[PDB]
């Protein structure tokens, strides 16, 4: 019946067009039957033609009938397409579409046509066909919809053509793999059809929404643009991943395709936010693809060159895309960043291609408006903490996961720079985000993930050097290795911040999770010590030592492969298994730290900073008792146990004595970041430049902290001590990181960001730290037994002709020649003891001419060093009568010494606008072009003027980054200039503390013989400093006296000389003569100090005859009787000098205290001008040691109390001040404030019992 009605309606039998009512009735019946039937039943029964009769009936002249055959054919091909294309294999889809579309009744179906039926019909048509027939159909069908048929019908066919292109692009974009054979060329044909039909898509997407002709045109065109821009990137990625594996591809235009949809519009259209997001994910699709670099011996192939040109065009277009995005307003920009669209921007920051990286860094600068890269990254970490710290970790981790020969290289240079940017935006001690806020659950994970990511990137950069060294130059690899080493150092320097931010119990828990990423990058570190570079080995050694010390501190282990590689490298097995160029210092340093150096100083800081300075006792508040000197310590550790409280007590007495006479003004600090980092309450502040320059704020400088208005005399307030820990010279204001003590700090509740304090300074730790270093590293000296047992070299006697022979060489004495010859003969410690006028410095100078026929000569004050330098420079005579001249060097920091100073000798051998003009000029063109814009020709200019502003701004930032290269190469020249100077010099002179500098560990020095002058006027741990450098012969010369017998029999500072003198007094070269002092100036401090044994020189009364002693009041000796100021002595000294002037280098005025020294200098400079600063030497007793003048004016303030702080030092002060003159000594002071002291009372009694007293009004008595 169905076939009989088909035969009735067939054009084969009837040979005529049937009436349209029968046609529509028949196809409505077919629709009812097909709704009743099933697809499997259609394939089984209906397929076994009705389809050909449908094609014949599709040519009727009725609009309704043509609509029913179209709806029918849609239902047939949708319900089962396999039978549809099996039963119609004779007719192609081309002829199907042409036969349907050439019908004369189809035009009013279009005209009389919430999508229309034809759009869904063509969706079913495209989905019903295989991929291989997609292209040829399109070559008709789109050409028939867009062009041949071209207004509701025109809008309908335009919508239809957009639907075809969208359906084909979505079909190709949803595939799991595009094959390299026919698949790539049909994708290429579709993309060429998209490029050809681009203008119609542009006018389609430019339509206004809500229009009567917009039936879905704009959304379809937008989806077409999105899918085309995704498919271009996917095709390029597929082609790259094919030709990098040496596979056949085939023998497109991505730049033009990106450029067309760029140049359509981006501001001033609907959905520009969505277009920008789609373009950003499209450029995220291809973020780890790099151009091809040929090998050194090989050449580039043809296909790789063609791919390089194509990739050049594509990356230029992508860079123009990213540069165009910096015209949006900040509101939509921060909406785009905050909102999965930040990942392409952050990945563009890393990229190795120049255009994409420059465009991304400009976009990052434009979003936050912080016009600097590190400031931009800091502001991004401030606003978007977890999105940015996740995007950076993902973008870096995506590229450092595989180590092969196809690994990218140009991406590894700007990974380190961005890691440095994040680190100095995250851990700065004033602008650090980790010093300001507490961390929640998500931020902890973000910071942890960034830590693991950056250490993995450093490990990947170090590991694959060998596979990279076959295709690049030598200089880029050397500079790359140096940069990676410096980044590793900067990364490992900041682990305490992570431990005390990512958490006393949880501190160790957080620290244990910080040191796990550095353990992975350990074998890579212990492989770069084999190179022939001299700068890299220093940094690798430092990083290995710091990592191993921190790992052994917190209780863990090193990887076994790193230890095995280090073990098979520095041990003899007789040669080494791996040839190195290491020295003998690095080998010892490693072979130790692994299992003569500088120890840590972190318990000393807490022991001195847990103190209250206003304690009224004579002992420290903590438990530190002393008074035990056993003189025969047979062990270094018992020596350490004895001499550590002997160091703490000395520091306490120095602190109190410096609190008495501080002479420093206070300054105010404001807290910038409070944080319990590295166990101490490390507070930071920004001190102005003028205060830091005026007060000399260096590291190791000790200050007070108080809330009081005058922190030196308010003990009732809230206060503590601090040590300056790190000083950084910023632009103007110095950044100072004070360290505190959070174990009883009274200001600790009052500590708050924004709390202005008042701070005054006391002393420096440098000598105490050097004494600690000498105490701890005494265990590796070569003079162990002589230091511990206090045994000098034995005494022995010479013949009576060589003594006269050496006496007749330097014109010496029988006391000063036997010592010369004995110290020439034997080795070890030789002791020479004399009062302050014998000639001990004269003996030492003749020793140098005796020994040199290099040397280190040391003295505990600077004045004795200056005297030794001048005497050793003036003239040297050998042991033949010959006048030679040796080379002199000063290892310190006077006028004549300034020409032989090591700091001056090293320094003497040592001695942007174009880019700024381009950036200012290029910014002027952007202002004119943008206001003129708000068309095609203009947009090419505004895209090419703005790329040079990206290019110049990259060159401006690269100018600042080049300063690190100039700063490093300055340092290797300094270590080589220093080492040359240290070998040309014949004699070298320094202080006891200055010779133990930290800079002599990395240099090559060996001083086999040390000479110490004034060895008995210093603490015992000071003379143990310049003995580390292989010294095996030391000569100790000094003065074991300067204390009276009632005071000689404290114990915290005696000497090294005094212990040996009390242990072995039989072998000490005594010098009993004197050769400067008049018999009065030699007769009173004799009987006070030297028990009538200091005998005067031959006929010295006649030698000391200068006129002035013609007056009894102005003789060689006369005592004058008049809060460490005492202006009365200032007026009396002024009157005495005025009297002597009324009646060059021979007049000196001496005060024992710094405040009266300041008053003396102020008053004298006042009315006697500035010429008396050099005429009369104004210095204390601590700056006048070892020297002499003809006339001296001594003015002491007042006697310290007997049981109080001081006393011993004031007695030593008085005895230094008394015996500095050769002709005249004039002592001043009042009687009432001086009779409290015992020895001043003995002095004033000796003054009366020999007519040496002047009392009453001196000012009337002088006139």
Ligand X SMILES: Nc1ncnc2c1ncn2[C@@H]1O[C@H](COP(=O)(O)OP(=O)(O)O)[C@@H](O)[C@H]1O
Report the interface residues with ligand X, using CB under 6 A.
812-813, 816, 836-842, 1075-1076
Yes or no: say if 351 and 363 are a contact pair by the CB < 8 Å rule: no
Question: For residue 647, which of 1040, 1022, 243, 298 has the smallest C-alpha distance?
Answer: 1022
CA separation for the pair 1217, 210 (Å, rounded) = 104
CA separation for the pair 402, 418 (Å, rounded) = 21
Alpha helices (runs of H) in 265-301, residue ranges in sequence order: 272-284
Please provide the distance, in angstroms rounded to a whole number, between the alpha carbons at the two ends of the chain: 159
CA separation for the pair 47, 85 (Å, rounded) = 11
The structure tokens 């828990």 sit at 509
> Rounded to a whole number, what is the largest CA-CA distance in the chain?
166
Q: Which long-range contacts (CB under 8 A, 24 or more apart) does 18-21 make?
A: 18/57, 18/60, 20/60, 20/61, 20/62, 20/64, 20/65
Q: 57 or 1076, CB closer to ligand X?
A: 1076
Q: 241 or 874, CB closer to ligand X?
A: 874
Smallest distance from ligand X to CB 633, Å:
30
Smallest distance from ligand X to CB 842, Å:
4
Q: 304 or 879, CB closer to ligand X?
A: 879
Smallest distance from ligand X to CB 1049, Å:
25
Q: 536 or 1225, CB closer to ligand X?
A: 1225
β-bridge pairing 1009-1012 and 1033-1038: parallel
Q: Which long-range contacts (CB under 8 A, 24 or more apart) does 976-979 make?
A: 977/906, 977/909, 977/910, 978/902, 978/906, 978/1003, 979/1003, 979/1004
Torsion of CA 241, 244, 250, 254, to 10 degrees: 60
Q: 456 or 1086, CB closer to ligand X?
A: 1086
Task: Output the six-digit token pair for 569.
Answer: 């490298």
Residue 1073 DSSP label: B
Q: 1077 or 1214, CB closer to ligand X?
A: 1077
Phi and psi at residue 548, to the nearest 5°? -70, -40
Q: 840 or 1198, CB closer to ligand X?
A: 840
Residues flagged as binding site: 816, 837, 839-842, 871, 1075, 1188
Q: For residue 67, what are the CA distances in angstroms to 73, 110, 137, 176, 657?
A: 10, 10, 22, 37, 111
Smallest distance from ligand X to CB 857, Å:
13
Question: For residue 1195, which of 1226, 1168, 1164 has the smallest C-alpha distance?
Answer: 1226
Question: For residue 407, which of 452, 472, 339, 358 has the smallest C-alpha distance?
Answer: 472
Smallest distance from ligand X to CB 1189, Å:
11
Task: Output the six-digit token pair for 289.
Answer: 């693809």
Question: For residue 492, which of 437, 534, 554, 548 has the smallest C-alpha distance?
Answer: 548
Smallest distance from ligand X to CB 1227, Å:
21
Residues flagged as binding site for ADP: 816, 837, 839-842, 871, 1075, 1188
Smallest distance from ligand X to CB 866, Å:
12
Partners of 667 in the β-ladder: 759
Smallest distance from ligand X to CB 888, Å:
17
Smallest distance from ligand X to CB 863, Å:
11
CA separation for the pair 1019, 1021 (Å, rounded) = 6
Q: 839 or 996, CB closer to ligand X?
A: 839
Smallest distance from ligand X to CB 991, Å:
17
Task: Output the six-digit token pair for 908.
Answer: 């003497």
Task: Output the six-digit token pair for 520.
Answer: 């992975």
Question: For residue 39, which of 119, 123, 128 has the smallest C-alpha distance?
Answer: 128
Smallest distance from ligand X to CB 987, Å:
17
Partners of 729 in the β-ladder: 734
Smallest distance from ligand X to CB 1263, Å:
36
Smallest distance from ligand X to CB 880, Å:
20
Q: Helix axis angle, 254-264 relative to 198-205, nearest 10°? A: 30
Q: 812 or 1258, CB closer to ligand X?
A: 812
**Strand order, beta sheet including 1221-1228:** 1177-1179, 1147-1150, 1189-1195, 1221-1228, 1117-1120, 1253-1254
Q: 837 or 953, CB closer to ligand X?
A: 837
Q: 219 or 842, CB closer to ligand X?
A: 842
Yes or no: say if 1012 and 1042 are a contact pair by the CB < 8 Å rule: no
Question: For residue 720, which of 772, 762, 660 has the smallest C-alpha distance?
Answer: 762
Question: For residue 43, which of 100, 103, 94, 87 has the smallest C-alpha distance?
Answer: 87
Smallest distance from ligand X to CB 989, Å:
15
Q: 93 or 837, CB closer to ligand X?
A: 837
Q: How many CB atoms lie within 10 A of CB 95?
A: 13
Q: 117 or 807, CB closer to ligand X?
A: 807
Q: 488 or 837, CB closer to ligand X?
A: 837
Task: Output the six-digit token pair for 157.
Answer: 């066919």
Give the H/E segment covering residue 33: helix 20-36
Q: 511 or 989, CB closer to ligand X?
A: 989
β-bridge pairing 1177-1179 and 1189-1195: unpaired
Query: DSSP 3-state assignment of 802?
Result: helix
Q: How many CB atoms lie within 10 A of CB 66?
A: 24
Position with the least CB separation from ligand X: 839
Query: DSSP 3-state assignment of 509?
Result: helix
Smallest distance from ligand X to CB 810, Å:
8
Partners of 686 in the β-ladder: 735
CA separation for the pair 371, 353 (Å, rounded) = 22
């Amino acid at each position: 019946r169905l076939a009989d009605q088909i035969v009735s309606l067939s054009f084969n039998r009837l040979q005529t067009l049937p009436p349209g009512q029968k046609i529509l009735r028949f196809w409505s019946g077919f629709l009812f039957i097909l709704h009743a039937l099933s697809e499997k039943q259609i394939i089984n029964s209906l397929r076994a033609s009705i389809y050909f009769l449908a094609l014949e009936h599709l040519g009727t002249n009725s609009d309704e009938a043509l609509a029913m055959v179209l709806r029918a054919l849609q239902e047939l091909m949708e319900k089962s397409s396999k039978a549809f294309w099996q039963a119609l294999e004779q007719v192609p889809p081309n002829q199907l579409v042409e036969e349907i579309f050439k019908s004369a009744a189809f035009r009013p179906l279009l005209n009389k046509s919430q999508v229309p039926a034809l759009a869904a019909w063509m969706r079913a048509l495209v989905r019903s066909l295989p991929s291989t027939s997609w292209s040829d159909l399109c070559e008709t069908s789109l050409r028939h919809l867009f062009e041949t048929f071209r207004q509701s019908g025109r809008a309908t066919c335009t919508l239809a053509g957009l639907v075809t292109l969208q359906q084909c692009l979505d079909g190709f974009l949803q595939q799991d793999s595009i094959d390299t054979g026919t698949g790539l060329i049909m994708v290429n044909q579709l993309l060429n059809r998209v490029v050809n039909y681009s203008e119609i898509i542009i006018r389609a997407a430019s339509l206004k929404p809500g229009d009567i002709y917009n039936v879905g045109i704009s959304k379809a065109a937008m989806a077409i643009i999105h899918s085309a821009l995704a498919l271009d990137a996917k095709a390029t990625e597929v082609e790259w991943a094919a030709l990098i594996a040496e596979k056949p591809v085939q023998d497109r235009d991505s730049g033009a395709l990106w450029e067309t949809f760029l140049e359509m519009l981006w501001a001033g259209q609907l959905g520009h936010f969505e277009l920008a997001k789609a373009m950003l994910m499209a450029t995220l699709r291809l973020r780890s693809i790099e151009q091809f670099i040929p090998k050194r011996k090989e050449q580039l192939k043809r296909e790789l060159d063609k791919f390089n040109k194509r990739y050049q065009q594509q990356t230029t277009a992508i860079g123009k895309m990213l540069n165009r995005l910096t015209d949006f307003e900040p509101e939509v920009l921060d909406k785009l960043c905050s909102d999965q669209t930040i990942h392409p921007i952050v990945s563009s920051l890393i990229h190795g291609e120049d255009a994409i990286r420059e465009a991304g860094f400009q976009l990052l600068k434009a979003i936050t408006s912080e016009s600097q890269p590190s400031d931009a990254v800091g502001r991004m970490l401030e606003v978007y903490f977890t999105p940015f710290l996740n995007a950076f970790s993902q973008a870096v981790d995506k590229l450092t996961a595989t180590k092969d020969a196809n690994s990218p290289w140009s991406h590894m240079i700007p990974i380190l720079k961005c890691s440095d940017f994040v680190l100095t935006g995250l851990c700065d001690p004033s602008s650090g985000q980790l010093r300001r806020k507490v961390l929640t659950t998500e931020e902890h994970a973000a910071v942890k993930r960034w830590w693991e990511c950056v250490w993995q990137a450093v490990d990947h950069s170090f590991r694959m050097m060998r596979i990279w060294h076959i295709k690049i130059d030598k200089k880029v690899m050397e500079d790359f290795c140096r940069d990676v080493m410096e980044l590793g150092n900067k990364l490992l320097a900041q682990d305490g911040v992570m431990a005390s931010s990512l958490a006393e119990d949880a501190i160790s828990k957080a620290m244990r999770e910080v040191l796990d990423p550095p353990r992975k990058c350990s074998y890579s570190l212990a492989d770069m010590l084999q190179l022939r570079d001299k700068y890299l080995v220093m940094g690798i050694i430092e990083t290995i030592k710091k990592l191993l010390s921190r790992l052994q501190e917190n209780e863990m282990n090193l990887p076994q492969r790193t230890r095995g590689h280090l073990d098979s490298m520095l041990k003899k097995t007789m040669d080494y298994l791996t040839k190195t160029n290491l020295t003998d210092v690095q080998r010892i340093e490693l072979l130790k730290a692994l299992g003569r150096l500088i120890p840590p100083m972190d318990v000393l800081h807490q022991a001195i900073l847990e103190w209250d300075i206003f304690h009224e006792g004579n002992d420290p508040p903590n438990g530190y008792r002393c008074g035990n000197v056993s003189d025969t310590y047979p062990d270094p550790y018992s020596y350490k146990q004895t001499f550590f409280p002997l160091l703490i007590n000395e520091a306490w007495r120095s602190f109190v004595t410096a609190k008495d006479e501080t002479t420093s003004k206070p300054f105010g600090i404001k807290v910038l970041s409070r944080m319990t980092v590295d166990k101490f309450m490390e507070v930071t502040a920004a001190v102005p430049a003028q205060i830091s320059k005026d007060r000399g704020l260096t590291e190791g400088d000790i200050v007070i902290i108080s809330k009081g208005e005058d922190p030196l005399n308010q003990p009732q307030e809230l206060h503590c001590l601090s040590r300056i820990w790190k000083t950084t010279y910023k632009k103007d204001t110095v950044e100072v990181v004070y360290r505190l003590n959070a174990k009883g700090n009274q200001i600790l509740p009052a500590l708050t960001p924004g709390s202005e304090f008042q701070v005054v300074k006391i002393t420096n730790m440098t000598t105490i730290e050097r004494e600690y270093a000498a105490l701890e590293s005494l265990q590796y000296y070569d003079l162990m037994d002589e230091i511990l047992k206090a045994q000098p070299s034995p005494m022995l006697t010479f013949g009576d002709e060589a003594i006269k022979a050496v006496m007749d060489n330097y014109q010496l004495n029988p006391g000063q020649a036997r010592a010369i010859l004995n110290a020439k003969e034997n080795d070890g410690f030789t002791l020479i003891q004399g009062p302050p006028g014998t000639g001990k410095t004269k003996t030492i100078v003749a020793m140098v001419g005796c020994l040199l026929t290099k040397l280190l000569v040391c003295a505990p004050s600077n004045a004795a060093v200056d005297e030794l330098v001048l005497r050793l420079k003036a003239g040297v005579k050998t042991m033949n009568g010959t006048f030679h001249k040796i080379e002199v060097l000063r290892l310190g920091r006077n006028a004549a010494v300034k020409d032989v100073t090591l700091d001056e000798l090293v320094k003497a051998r040592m001695d942007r606008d174009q880019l700024h003009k381009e950036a200012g000029e290029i910014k002027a063109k952007l202002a004119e072009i943008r206001p003129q814009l708000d068309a095609m020709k203009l947009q090419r200019e505004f895209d090419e003027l703005k790329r040079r502003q990206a290019h110049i701004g990259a060159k401006i930032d690269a100018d600042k980054a080049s300063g690190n290269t100039y700063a490093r190469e300055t340092e290797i020249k300094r270590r080589q200039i220093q080492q040359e100077i240290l070998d040309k010099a014949q004699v070298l002179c320094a202080t006891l503390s200055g010779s133990g500098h930290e800079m002599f560990k990395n240099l090559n020095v060996e001083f086999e013989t040390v000479i110490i002058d004034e060895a008995a006027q210093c603490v015992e741990l000071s003379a143990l400093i310049p003995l580390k450098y292989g010294c095996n012969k030391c000569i100790l010369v000094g003065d074991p006296k300067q204390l009276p017998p009632t005071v000689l029999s404290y114990g915290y500072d005696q000497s090294l000389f005094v212990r040996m003198q009390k242990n072995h007094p039989k072998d000490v070269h005594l010098l009993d003569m004197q050769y400067r002092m008049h018999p009065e100036i030699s007769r009173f401090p004799s009987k006070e100090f030297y028990e009538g044994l200091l005998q005067d020189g031959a006929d010295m009364a006649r030698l000391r005859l200068q006129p002035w002693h013609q007056s009894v009041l102005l003789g060689p000796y006369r005592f004058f009787d008049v809060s460490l100021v005492n202006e009365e002595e200032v007026k009396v000294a002024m009157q005495l000098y005025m009297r002597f002037r009324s009646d060059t280098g021979k007049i000196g005025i001496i005060t024992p205290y710094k405040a009266q020294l300041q008053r003396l200098r102020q008053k004298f400079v006042e009315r006697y001008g500035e010429s008396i600063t050099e005429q009369i030497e104004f210095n204390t007793t601590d700056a006048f040691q070892g020297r002499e003048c003809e006339i001296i004016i001594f003015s002491c303030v007042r006697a310290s109390p007997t049981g109080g702080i001081g006393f011993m030092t004031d007695i030593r002060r008085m005895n230094v001040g008394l015996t500095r003159a050769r002709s005249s000594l004039w002592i001043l002071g009042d009687s009432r404030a001086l009779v409290q002291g015992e020895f001043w009372a003995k002095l004033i009694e000796d003054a009366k019992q020999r007519d040496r007293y002047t009392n009453g009004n001196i000012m009337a008595l002088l006139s």
